[PDB]
Amino acid sequence: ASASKAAAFAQGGSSDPVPMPGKYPVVFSTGAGEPTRDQEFALPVHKAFPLFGSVSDKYRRNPRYAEFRAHSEFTDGVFGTHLAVSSLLRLAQQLVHAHVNMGLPLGDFAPLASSDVRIPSALASVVNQFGEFSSPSIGTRFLLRDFEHAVSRVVFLADQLWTNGNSHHIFARSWLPMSNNDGNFKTIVASRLLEFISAGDLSILPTVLEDAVLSGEVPEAWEQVKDLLGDAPGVGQVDRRDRFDFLFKSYADVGQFTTAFTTQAASDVLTELGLPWNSPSAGHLNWQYSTKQRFTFLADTWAKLSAAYSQFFELSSGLATRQSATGSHAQMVDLTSVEGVTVLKAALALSAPEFSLAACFPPSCIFVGGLTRRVVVTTSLSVSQRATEFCQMDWR
Amino acid sequence: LTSVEGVTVLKAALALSAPEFSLAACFPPSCIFVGGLTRRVVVTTSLSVSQRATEFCQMDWR
Amino acid sequence: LTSVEGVTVLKAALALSAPEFSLAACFPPSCIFVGGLTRRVVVTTSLSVSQRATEFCQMDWR
Amino acid sequence: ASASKAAAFAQGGSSDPVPMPGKYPVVFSTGAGEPTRDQEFALPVHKAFPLFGSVSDKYRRNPRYAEFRAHSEFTDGVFGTHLAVSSLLRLAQQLVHAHVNMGLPLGDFAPLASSDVRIPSALASVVNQFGEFSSPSIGTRFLLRDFEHAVSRVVFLADQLWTNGNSHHIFARSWLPMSNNDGNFKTIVASRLLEFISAGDLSILPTVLEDAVLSGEVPEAWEQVKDLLGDAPGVGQVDRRDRFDFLFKSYADVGQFTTAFTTQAASDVLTELGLPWNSPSAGHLNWQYSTKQRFTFLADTWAKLSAAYSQFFELSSGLATRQSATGSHAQMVDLTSVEGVTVLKAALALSAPEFSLAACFPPSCIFVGGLTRRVVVTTSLSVSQRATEFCQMDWR
Amino acid sequence: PVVFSTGAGEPTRDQEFALPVHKAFPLFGSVSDKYRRNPRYAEFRAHSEFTDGVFGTHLAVS
């Protein structure tokens, strides 16, 4: 027990990603009150009413209230121009939030986020694209759109939700994180990944080498779709993009959609039902028309469903900022069912919440950055200094 | 509003008494439509009207 | 009054709360032809609106 | 004393069915007060008055109050909207309940289950079908309708009350539980049971193989009637459905449905009179017209049954939620009478109730499930570790 | 027009008549409060009405 310039430092450094999964569908299946008889069945319909209770809290008042802003994140009003409170936040939100709360431990060393200027923009879109069209496209379709990492405005975290695919297939092939950038760019998607990180690892995971038959499927197509996603979706809008995103997510590529996620009901349905701009300025008009209509749908919420005052379960959003929004080790998806469940994986989460997570196993497509920057200058203790000092105790 | 020699503040909306008549400065008017609505919404998944009926009915018998 | 699965009793006029739910066991009176009338009349042979305004105005000058 | 990661966990999991037997008839024969002389006989009819005295309690207030709701099964008020009570529950109800309370032991490992969205639906019907039309069809007919596992709305636990018949005759054959789902399906008869689980076990239990005489009179029709129940009752109503079912439950089929079925009368009389909807359509309207009327008839319990003010024996159904409704092995009937009465109880039920709970009740045809999920993750003590340790106490 | 006719202080002599014109000065005192800070401060927002900043981007006091 000797002494050489000690301290105690806290840190934060890592990445985070999110997905739109069939998870919401399990949370909006209408289990929450469909079988509740408080003759509230006076007021019509209850199909979308429940589902739509998903957004308007899980993206602005819950997560973007403490996670975003507090994350050393000086947020611009015009993305929170309207701090919202929807008492409809069933047992899923204060729960959901705890479930999905952007933030990792400090006793460890991680954090979350990569594009909250593009993600939300899309989410809002989805809430509108979904909570406006036909509320429940039965898994197939709506789920596709959301898990299809739908068309972008050039930023979209997509590339990550897509990176999932390629990696899974290439067993032996382990890629340098650089592959995480492949999302956008022209050539570098046909040199780094596709050619080098393919004619190398691709020429192995499936070395068809077919002759006079065009390497259809068998890696070479996923790469093409990859090459596409590189040059043919970043050149702008127009059918040339959808049609050639769709062509790349539609036909011939029926083998490329099998890797990731897809149904001829997302693409030919959703995709042919959104107008490429359904992700770009839709993401805008969904914030300055849909967010103001979010109002209507929120006020409608704080007016209609509010009327659900007569049951006695809901509560209101009383501004976090004190409530916070980070802490849950949503890291590494805790799921594995076989006769009996099995919550697994790294992220020494908790014990009281863990197992309570059944309602919702939060999952941020995190990258994970083993970083504990115990940065230390020694303009006062040239390592050696200590050395003699300590050395001068083993002598006597 | 209704003036004839002397004023006459009229009409439904059991407003107030202290402000009413003080309103001279400005008789506020919202082109309202008015919706006679008192939604005493009531589910009875615990008291099929009848239930009460016998209960009460079972007091007029004795 | 309306009955569907459960019994809902909407009462246009803010009636009561102790009788309401008790007074559904049978009665719910006739077809009145409501008359929105709150005759809050007011002669002005004492305070020609100007006088008031003239006064109140004398507290918005200084 | 080797210990290694012990615990102690309690569970629940198993089946449970129910039947409408001549059992009720023994409980409503009018032996509870027919000979009582208090001059209560003030110009009144006491035929149905007794029989219909247990209905409104043995299915909502008694069983569904704790059994159902507490069984962790999210109940909809519109199946218990009128959580009313009935004080006419003489000595048969608080008794009956204890006689038929669904909830096997945990010290063992079983529970209750078999569509409480269809059973009650039909029961309420019977209550109406019986307690309204013919209040005492003299065993033959009403008991039939009850036991006949009467027409369904596609669900009905009939399939099980019917499976009791095809397994009884087939001694040489035993079947895989997969024969339980034998209820509905267009193939149940053209595949598994009927053909395979018949051309194999049926071609032995009755291998007539008759020529130019059509072999149906030899339990190949039981397969046919089975066939029918497979394709001809699930195709809707078409009235003939009764005609068919009836045909299959009558016209010559009499030699078919007499292995585990009642008198055809309860089919042409009851069924035909009732009108195929008197099991699906009736149930609903019997739950939202008859359950409301259940009150008009509950009034019969709290007005007609209430008029019993002076005799002083009645006063049942005070609580619920707290009184519970599960924990009596009134299951595996296993009762036999010869000179003396012997009551064999497969499951170690009780000793104070047993011998007391033979006065009438001995619940349905459960399909036991030997299940004691004593699961145990091994991410702490890889068997070797333990063995490695214990072994370190067998070396020295 | 009856509220901006200039009754409020036109006949008030506090030699404030040093500073020119007083025609629109009074009338224009009508808005900038009766539509954002007065009514849209509690009525709008509180009316279960989650308002967008860009209509109250500037909460005013006159």
PDB file of all heavy atoms in Angstrom, chain A residues 8-46, unseen atoms left out:
ATOM      1  N   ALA A   8      -9.644   9.228  -8.889  1.00  0.00           N
ATOM      2  CA  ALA A   8     -10.987   8.678  -8.992  1.00  0.00           C
ATOM      3  C   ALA A   8     -11.749   9.440 -10.060  1.00  0.00           C
ATOM      4  O   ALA A   8     -12.317  10.498  -9.794  1.00  0.00           O
ATOM      5  N   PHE A   9     -11.737   8.917 -11.282  1.00  0.00           N
ATOM      6  CA  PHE A   9     -12.387   9.610 -12.376  1.00  0.00           C
ATOM      7  C   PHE A   9     -13.570   8.874 -12.985  1.00  0.00           C
ATOM      8  O   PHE A   9     -13.554   7.655 -13.150  1.00  0.00           O
ATOM      9  N   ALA A  10     -14.592   9.653 -13.337  1.00  0.00           N
ATOM     10  CA  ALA A  10     -15.794   9.150 -13.979  1.00  0.00           C
ATOM     11  C   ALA A  10     -15.768   9.511 -15.457  1.00  0.00           C
ATOM     12  O   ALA A  10     -15.251  10.563 -15.826  1.00  0.00           O
ATOM     13  N   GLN A  11     -16.303   8.640 -16.310  1.00  0.00           N
ATOM     14  CA  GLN A  11     -16.264   8.903 -17.736  1.00  0.00           C
ATOM     15  C   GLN A  11     -17.494   8.444 -18.503  1.00  0.00           C
ATOM     16  O   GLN A  11     -18.409   7.837 -17.952  1.00  0.00           O
ATOM     17  N   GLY A  12     -17.485   8.759 -19.799  1.00  0.00           N
ATOM     18  CA  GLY A  12     -18.557   8.417 -20.713  1.00  0.00           C
ATOM     19  C   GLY A  12     -18.101   8.486 -22.164  1.00  0.00           C
ATOM     20  O   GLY A  12     -17.638   9.525 -22.638  1.00  0.00           O
ATOM     21  N   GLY A  13     -18.236   7.359 -22.860  1.00  0.00           N
ATOM     22  CA  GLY A  13     -17.845   7.253 -24.252  1.00  0.00           C
ATOM     23  C   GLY A  13     -18.261   5.928 -24.871  1.00  0.00           C
ATOM     24  O   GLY A  13     -17.760   4.866 -24.508  1.00  0.00           O
ATOM     25  N   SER A  14     -19.183   6.010 -25.825  1.00  0.00           N
ATOM     26  CA  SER A  14     -19.690   4.854 -26.538  1.00  0.00           C
ATOM     27  C   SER A  14     -20.764   5.272 -27.527  1.00  0.00           C
ATOM     28  O   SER A  14     -21.124   6.446 -27.614  1.00  0.00           O
ATOM     29  N   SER A  15     -21.292   4.303 -28.272  1.00  0.00           N
ATOM     30  CA  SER A  15     -22.308   4.597 -29.257  1.00  0.00           C
ATOM     31  C   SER A  15     -23.657   3.977 -28.933  1.00  0.00           C
ATOM     32  O   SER A  15     -23.793   3.168 -28.012  1.00  0.00           O
ATOM     33  N   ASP A  16     -24.654   4.367 -29.729  1.00  0.00           N
ATOM     34  CA  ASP A  16     -26.008   3.865 -29.581  1.00  0.00           C
ATOM     35  C   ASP A  16     -26.817   3.944 -30.865  1.00  0.00           C
ATOM     36  O   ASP A  16     -26.687   4.874 -31.656  1.00  0.00           O
ATOM     37  N   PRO A  17     -27.658   2.927 -31.028  1.00  0.00           N
ATOM     38  CA  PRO A  17     -28.532   2.799 -32.173  1.00  0.00           C
ATOM     39  C   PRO A  17     -29.891   2.270 -31.746  1.00  0.00           C
ATOM     40  O   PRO A  17     -30.021   1.615 -30.714  1.00  0.00           O
ATOM     41  N   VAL A  18     -30.906   2.586 -32.537  1.00  0.00           N
ATOM     42  CA  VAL A  18     -32.248   2.154 -32.225  1.00  0.00           C
ATOM     43  C   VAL A  18     -32.925   1.539 -33.432  1.00  0.00           C
ATOM     44  O   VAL A  18     -32.560   1.802 -34.577  1.00  0.00           O
ATOM     45  N   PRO A  19     -33.919   0.709 -33.158  1.00  0.00           N
ATOM     46  CA  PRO A  19     -34.650   0.057 -34.216  1.00  0.00           C
ATOM     47  C   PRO A  19     -36.145   0.123 -33.969  1.00  0.00           C
ATOM     48  O   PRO A  19     -36.597   0.330 -32.844  1.00  0.00           O
ATOM     49  N   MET A  20     -36.896  -0.039 -35.049  1.00  0.00           N
ATOM     50  CA  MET A  20     -38.339  -0.090 -35.002  1.00  0.00           C
ATOM     51  C   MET A  20     -38.708  -1.542 -35.244  1.00  0.00           C
ATOM     52  O   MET A  20     -38.646  -2.032 -36.370  1.00  0.00           O
ATOM     53  N   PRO A  21     -38.993  -2.257 -34.161  1.00  0.00           N
ATOM     54  CA  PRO A  21     -39.223  -3.687 -34.237  1.00  0.00           C
ATOM     55  C   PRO A  21     -40.625  -4.125 -33.856  1.00  0.00           C
ATOM     56  O   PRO A  21     -41.358  -3.397 -33.188  1.00  0.00           O
ATOM     57  N   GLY A  22     -40.950  -5.372 -34.204  1.00  0.00           N
ATOM     58  CA  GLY A  22     -42.234  -5.979 -33.894  1.00  0.00           C
ATOM     59  C   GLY A  22     -42.536  -5.943 -32.405  1.00  0.00           C
ATOM     60  O   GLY A  22     -43.563  -6.442 -31.942  1.00  0.00           O
ATOM     61  N   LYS A  23     -41.622  -5.306 -31.677  1.00  0.00           N
ATOM     62  CA  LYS A  23     -41.701  -5.079 -30.252  1.00  0.00           C
ATOM     63  C   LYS A  23     -42.865  -4.156 -29.942  1.00  0.00           C
ATOM     64  O   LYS A  23     -43.664  -4.426 -29.047  1.00  0.00           O
ATOM     65  N   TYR A  24     -42.984  -3.062 -30.695  1.00  0.00           N
ATOM     66  CA  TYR A  24     -44.114  -2.178 -30.487  1.00  0.00           C
ATOM     67  C   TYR A  24     -45.421  -2.934 -30.659  1.00  0.00           C
ATOM     68  O   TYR A  24     -46.344  -2.774 -29.867  1.00  0.00           O
ATOM     69  N   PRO A  25     -45.477  -3.809 -31.660  1.00  0.00           N
ATOM     70  CA  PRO A  25     -46.658  -4.608 -31.898  1.00  0.00           C
ATOM     71  C   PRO A  25     -47.093  -5.447 -30.708  1.00  0.00           C
ATOM     72  O   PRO A  25     -48.282  -5.700 -30.520  1.00  0.00           O
ATOM     73  N   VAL A  26     -46.132  -5.873 -29.897  1.00  0.00           N
ATOM     74  CA  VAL A  26     -46.456  -6.660 -28.725  1.00  0.00           C
ATOM     75  C   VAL A  26     -46.942  -5.774 -27.594  1.00  0.00           C
ATOM     76  O   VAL A  26     -47.625  -6.225 -26.674  1.00  0.00           O
ATOM     77  N   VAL A  27     -46.584  -4.496 -27.691  1.00  0.00           N
ATOM     78  CA  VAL A  27     -46.962  -3.509 -26.702  1.00  0.00           C
ATOM     79  C   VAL A  27     -48.250  -2.790 -27.071  1.00  0.00           C
ATOM     80  O   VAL A  27     -48.824  -2.068 -26.256  1.00  0.00           O
ATOM     81  N   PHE A  28     -48.706  -2.998 -28.304  1.00  0.00           N
ATOM     82  CA  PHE A  28     -49.931  -2.371 -28.768  1.00  0.00           C
ATOM     83  C   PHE A  28     -50.977  -3.382 -29.211  1.00  0.00           C
ATOM     84  O   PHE A  28     -51.983  -3.022 -29.820  1.00  0.00           O
ATOM     85  N   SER A  29     -50.715  -4.655 -28.935  1.00  0.00           N
ATOM     86  CA  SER A  29     -51.635  -5.708 -29.320  1.00  0.00           C
ATOM     87  C   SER A  29     -52.995  -5.532 -28.663  1.00  0.00           C
ATOM     88  O   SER A  29     -53.952  -6.237 -28.981  1.00  0.00           O
ATOM     89  N   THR A  30     -53.058  -4.576 -27.738  1.00  0.00           N
ATOM     90  CA  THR A  30     -54.274  -4.245 -27.017  1.00  0.00           C
ATOM     91  C   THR A  30     -54.524  -5.127 -25.805  1.00  0.00           C
ATOM     92  O   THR A  30     -55.665  -5.394 -25.435  1.00  0.00           O
ATOM     93  N   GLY A  31     -53.447  -5.572 -25.175  1.00  0.00           N
ATOM     94  CA  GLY A  31     -53.579  -6.394 -23.994  1.00  0.00           C
ATOM     95  C   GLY A  31     -53.920  -5.537 -22.788  1.00  0.00           C
ATOM     96  O   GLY A  31     -54.695  -5.939 -21.926  1.00  0.00           O
ATOM     97  N   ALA A  32     -53.361  -4.326 -22.793  1.00  0.00           N
ATOM     98  CA  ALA A  32     -53.498  -3.345 -21.728  1.00  0.00           C
ATOM     99  C   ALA A  32     -54.895  -3.080 -21.177  1.00  0.00           C
ATOM    100  O   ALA A  32     -55.035  -2.794 -19.988  1.00  0.00           O
ATOM    101  N   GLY A  33     -55.932  -3.152 -22.006  1.00  0.00           N
ATOM    102  CA  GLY A  33     -57.263  -2.880 -21.487  1.00  0.00           C
ATOM    103  C   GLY A  33     -58.401  -3.415 -22.343  1.00  0.00           C
ATOM    104  O   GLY A  33     -59.573  -3.191 -22.039  1.00  0.00           O
ATOM    105  N   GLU A  34     -58.056  -4.122 -23.413  1.00  0.00           N
ATOM    106  CA  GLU A  34     -59.060  -4.675 -24.302  1.00  0.00           C
ATOM    107  C   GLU A  34     -60.084  -5.527 -23.567  1.00  0.00           C
ATOM    108  O   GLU A  34     -61.264  -5.540 -23.916  1.00  0.00           O
ATOM    109  N   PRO A  35     -59.619  -6.245 -22.548  1.00  0.00           N
ATOM    110  CA  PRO A  35     -60.478  -7.112 -21.768  1.00  0.00           C
ATOM    111  C   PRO A  35     -60.879  -6.484 -20.443  1.00  0.00           C
ATOM    112  O   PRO A  35     -61.046  -7.172 -19.439  1.00  0.00           O
ATOM    113  N   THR A  36     -61.017  -5.166 -20.453  1.00  0.00           N
ATOM    114  CA  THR A  36     -61.409  -4.435 -19.266  1.00  0.00           C
ATOM    115  C   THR A  36     -62.819  -3.903 -19.394  1.00  0.00           C
ATOM    116  O   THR A  36     -63.121  -3.105 -20.281  1.00  0.00           O
ATOM    117  N   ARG A  37     -63.692  -4.376 -18.518  1.00  0.00           N
ATOM    118  CA  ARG A  37     -65.073  -3.968 -18.609  1.00  0.00           C
ATOM    119  C   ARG A  37     -65.532  -2.914 -17.624  1.00  0.00           C
ATOM    120  O   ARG A  37     -66.040  -3.198 -16.539  1.00  0.00           O
ATOM    121  N   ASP A  38     -65.345  -1.678 -18.067  1.00  0.00           N
ATOM    122  CA  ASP A  38     -65.766  -0.494 -17.357  1.00  0.00           C
ATOM    123  C   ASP A  38     -66.632   0.299 -18.317  1.00  0.00           C
ATOM    124  O   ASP A  38     -66.537   1.519 -18.419  1.00  0.00           O
ATOM    125  N   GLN A  39     -67.470  -0.468 -19.021  1.00  0.00           N
ATOM    126  CA  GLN A  39     -68.406  -0.011 -20.036  1.00  0.00           C
ATOM    127  C   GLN A  39     -67.985   1.252 -20.759  1.00  0.00           C
ATOM    128  O   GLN A  39     -68.814   2.013 -21.255  1.00  0.00           O
ATOM    129  N   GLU A  40     -66.672   1.446 -20.829  1.00  0.00           N
ATOM    130  CA  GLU A  40     -66.075   2.573 -21.508  1.00  0.00           C
ATOM    131  C   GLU A  40     -66.283   2.398 -23.002  1.00  0.00           C
ATOM    132  O   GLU A  40     -65.862   3.212 -23.819  1.00  0.00           O
ATOM    133  N   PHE A  41     -66.940   1.284 -23.319  1.00  0.00           N
ATOM    134  CA  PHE A  41     -67.258   0.895 -24.675  1.00  0.00           C
ATOM    135  C   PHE A  41     -68.406   1.709 -25.245  1.00  0.00           C
ATOM    136  O   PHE A  41     -69.072   1.305 -26.197  1.00  0.00           O
ATOM    137  N   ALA A  42     -68.612   2.873 -24.637  1.00  0.00           N
ATOM    138  CA  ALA A  42     -69.609   3.816 -25.099  1.00  0.00           C
ATOM    139  C   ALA A  42     -68.993   4.589 -26.250  1.00  0.00           C
ATOM    140  O   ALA A  42     -69.597   4.764 -27.308  1.00  0.00           O
ATOM    141  N   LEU A  43     -67.751   5.009 -26.027  1.00  0.00           N
ATOM    142  CA  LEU A  43     -66.967   5.709 -27.024  1.00  0.00           C
ATOM    143  C   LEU A  43     -66.400   4.704 -28.009  1.00  0.00           C
ATOM    144  O   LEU A  43     -65.713   3.760 -27.616  1.00  0.00           O
ATOM    145  N   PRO A  44     -66.753   4.902 -29.280  1.00  0.00           N
ATOM    146  CA  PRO A  44     -66.380   4.037 -30.384  1.00  0.00           C
ATOM    147  C   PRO A  44     -64.962   3.491 -30.347  1.00  0.00           C
ATOM    148  O   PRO A  44     -64.276   3.521 -29.330  1.00  0.00           O
ATOM    149  N   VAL A  45     -64.574   2.977 -31.510  1.00  0.00           N
ATOM    150  CA  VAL A  45     -63.296   2.356 -31.838  1.00  0.00           C
ATOM    151  C   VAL A  45     -62.205   2.325 -30.774  1.00  0.00           C
ATOM    152  O   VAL A  45     -62.114   3.196 -29.907  1.00  0.00           O
ATOM    153  N   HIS A  46     -61.349   1.307 -30.869  1.00  0.00           N
ATOM    154  CA  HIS A  46     -60.235   1.122 -29.950  1.00  0.00           C
ATOM    155  C   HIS A  46     -59.074   0.379 -30.601  1.00  0.00           C
ATOM    156  O   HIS A  46     -58.250  -0.231 -29.921  1.00  0.00           O
TER     157      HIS A  46
END
